[PDB]
Design an enzyme around this catalytic site. Structure first.
Site, PDB file in Angstrom:
ATOM      1  N   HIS A   1       0.813  -1.213   0.000  1.00 40.67           N
ATOM      2  CA  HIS A   1       0.000   0.000   0.000  1.00 40.67           C
ATOM      3  C   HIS A   1       0.846   1.262   0.000  1.00 40.67           C
ATOM      4  O   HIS A   1       0.337   2.341   0.291  1.00 40.67           O
ATOM      5  CB  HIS A   1      -0.921   0.036   1.215  1.00 40.67           C
ATOM      6  CG  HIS A   1      -1.636  -1.248   1.470  1.00 40.67           C
ATOM      7  ND1 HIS A   1      -2.524  -1.794   0.570  1.00 40.67           N
ATOM      8  CD2 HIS A   1      -1.609  -2.085   2.530  1.00 40.67           C
ATOM      9  CE1 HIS A   1      -3.012  -2.917   1.064  1.00 40.67           C
ATOM     10  NE2 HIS A   1      -2.473  -3.117   2.252  1.00 40.67           N
TER      11      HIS A   1
ATOM     12  N   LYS B   1      -5.832   0.139  10.997  1.00 39.63           N
ATOM     13  CA  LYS B   1      -6.856   0.043   9.962  1.00 39.63           C
ATOM     14  C   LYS B   1      -7.753  -1.149  10.253  1.00 39.63           C
ATOM     15  O   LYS B   1      -7.264  -2.226  10.600  1.00 39.63           O
ATOM     16  CB  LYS B   1      -6.219  -0.083   8.582  1.00 39.63           C
ATOM     17  CG  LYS B   1      -5.285   1.076   8.232  1.00 39.63           C
ATOM     18  CD  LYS B   1      -5.059   1.165   6.732  1.00 39.63           C
ATOM     19  CE  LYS B   1      -4.495  -0.134   6.172  1.00 39.63           C
ATOM     20  NZ  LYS B   1      -3.134  -0.414   6.683  1.00 39.63           N
TER      21      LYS B   1
ATOM     22  N   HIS C   1      -6.948  -4.774  -0.358  1.00 34.31           N
ATOM     23  CA  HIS C   1      -6.261  -6.058  -0.472  1.00 34.31           C
ATOM     24  C   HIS C   1      -6.841  -6.848  -1.638  1.00 34.31           C
ATOM     25  O   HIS C   1      -6.668  -8.060  -1.720  1.00 34.31           O
ATOM     26  CB  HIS C   1      -6.403  -6.885   0.809  1.00 34.31           C
ATOM     27  CG  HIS C   1      -5.918  -6.192   2.044  1.00 34.31           C
ATOM     28  ND1 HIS C   1      -6.770  -5.574   2.933  1.00 34.31           N
ATOM     29  CD2 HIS C   1      -4.671  -6.036   2.546  1.00 34.31           C
ATOM     30  CE1 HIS C   1      -6.069  -5.060   3.927  1.00 34.31           C
ATOM     31  NE2 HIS C   1      -4.793  -5.326   3.717  1.00 34.31           N
TER      32      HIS C   1
HETATM   33  O1  2HA Z   1      -2.416  -5.021   3.946  1.00 31.74           O
HETATM   34  C1  2HA Z   1      -3.635  -5.166   4.651  1.00 31.74           C
HETATM   35  C2  2HA Z   1      -3.925  -3.874   5.420  1.00 31.74           C
HETATM   36  O2  2HA Z   1      -2.864  -3.692   6.338  1.00 31.74           O
HETATM   37  C3  2HA Z   1      -3.525  -6.301   5.673  1.00 31.74           C
HETATM   38  O3  2HA Z   1      -4.747  -6.302   6.382  1.00 31.74           O
END
Ligand code: 2HA
Ligand code: 2HA
Lengths: 318, 318
Positions: free
Chosen positions: B55, B103, B207
């Site tokens: 990300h 998150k 994801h």
């Molecule tokens: O990459 C995703 C959010 O961190 C794993 O839940």
């Protein structure tokens, strides 16, 4: 080194080999690494356990009438994910609730407890027992307290019987608490597991965690002296006391050596004038191809425990 | 497809590339995938966040004075382990305590909260805030409630400023609670991330989680109509209201397209006669090579929030 295919397929291929061989267990809808007993549901408390793969027969081999309802198999030496465990909880329930049998490791406990919470939001009644029988050396890595090892297998059997005898979730929970406190284990390794010299280490973890003392090669009797010595300090032996004994191989240790070791243990115990009412030898919770073994004693402070150890079961490995 | 080396090395090699390039962050003792700010400790509340890799710049790029103290980077699309997070907590503390910015995903929350517990046993004062800004579609897979997405970046900035202004753990905790409730986000994907047709999906997860509606290709304006439409239902727009806006690309969407989209959003909002006091466009929380974007609005129900959004910071990506 290993008889495998693609390293990332070992768990799924194994479970497929397992179900092929022993249709008597089933793998939950080919999307989950959960092994459940084919024994028809009948309002018994369901027992669910699991952990990393690499400890076979640990967990999957103890799935059957009289023991576990289902075993949740993680990646090698890795706790199952909460979704896998959650799926096993709701699929194993028979209407009487579910008891989680969890080996004390940071990951396993985190995961199973989350799964528990998930399952409770769906109104499933679940209790838990954390097995911390390894007296080797406290707060290994991030394990909070004592690691859960081979003694877990006895917990399965004892609670397994109780559940089969139509005891309630509450009663079984109370029994687990008393039982786990009376189970103590210590092991040693001559070699570490390989994941897909002339030295031994006392108190090695089943994930190849470090122990408390490394030593140059010792004889069977000398090793036995160390282990019984540690367990004697823990239990504080007194004449007349009743115990059971489990000698458990780590995977690559021949049975011959486990029985030679059993023999040494017997000798070291005769001095104590304690009563050994239960004996068991073999590979029940391994660590891949580790050479080594562990010694487990359960204080038999209740005639029911022995009856449960000897209760009928129909599992692959018992 | 990808510029990488060995697929299992991507996180470590990236972090090494990151520290080489921007000595201004550091990687904690080459045993942990934690990126910490070089900014000298000075009794400020420490902010710690993280999650899966994939990300970027999410988290590591927002480590600096005025924002995060440290970011804990997991495997690709995988939450960091509790030990990694625990290590980041105790290394980031400045004596004023630590706030976890998490998150909302099953794994992330499980892990950070465990890490929290670990850190509290060492007498570290820690609070937490769970960001659940994704209004796409409720309880995605096993996420309990709404997924945490791009709006997290605003939370970093707003709390980042407060911490930098010497606010106490308690105050910052109270602010986080109010702030997170006023941040809402919805996104869409033209393609899924590839982990080392002519259709779009609304509400895709970062994801590559599934969304709520798949549709044949729509124009920028049509897509914008859907997203602003959803956010309008959520916030219940009224003339005079103040908002900030973030248009965030998913990784493989050119800036040109994000600005064309911003333009459409502007048009759709003029009707509402609301006051847009903060605007921001770019790749701030991506999903590897996903083509797509998301629209985030924060209701500015406090002049301090805007001041904090505009507060000074020294991070790699802000
Ligand atoms: O990459 C995703 C959010 O961190 C794993 O839940
Ligand atoms: O395999 C290990 C015990 O389950 C993982 O903690």
């Amino acid at each position: 080194e290993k008889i495998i295919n693609q390293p990332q397929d070992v768990v799924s291929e194994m479970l497929d080999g397992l179900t092929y061989a022993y249709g008597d267990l089933i793998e939950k809808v080919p999307d989950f690494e959960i092994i459940q007993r084919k024994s028809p549901k009948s309002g018994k408390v369901a027992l669910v356990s699991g952990g990393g793969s690499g400890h076979e027969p640990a967990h999957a081999g103890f799935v059957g009438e009289g023991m576990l309802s289902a075993a949740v198999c993680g990646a090698i030496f890795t706790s199952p994910t909460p979704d896998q465990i959650y799926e096993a909880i709701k699929s194993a329930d028979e209407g009487a609730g579910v008891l989680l049998i969890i080996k004390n490791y940071l990951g396993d406990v985190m995961n199973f407890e989350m799964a528990r919470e998930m399952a409770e939001m769906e109104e499933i009644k679940v209790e838990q027992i954390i097995v911390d029988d390894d007296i080797a050396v406290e707060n290994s890595l991030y394990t909070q307290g004592r690691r859960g090892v081979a003694g877990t297998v006895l917990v399965h059997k004892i609670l397994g019987a109780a559940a089969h005898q139509e005891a309630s979730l509450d009663e079984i929970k109370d029994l687990a608490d008393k039982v786990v406190k009376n189970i103590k284990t210590i092991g040693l390794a001559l070699s570490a597991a390989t994941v897909p010299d002339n030295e031994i280490e006392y108190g090695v973890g089943i994930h190849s965690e470090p122990g408390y003392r490394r030593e140059k090669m010792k004889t069977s009797y000398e090793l036995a002296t160390e282990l019984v010595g540690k367990l004697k300090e823990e239990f504080k032996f007194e004449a007349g006391q009743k115990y059971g004994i489990l000698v458990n191989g780590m995977g690559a240790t021949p049975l011959m050596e486990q029985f030679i070791f059993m023999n040494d243990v017997a000798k070291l115990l005769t001095e104590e004038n304690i009563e050994i009412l239960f004996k068991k030898v073999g590979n029940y919770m391994t660590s891949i191809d580790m050479a080594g073994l562990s010694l487990t004693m359960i204080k038999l402070e209740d005639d029911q425990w022995l009856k449960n150890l000897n209760e009928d079961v129909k599992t692959i490995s018992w």
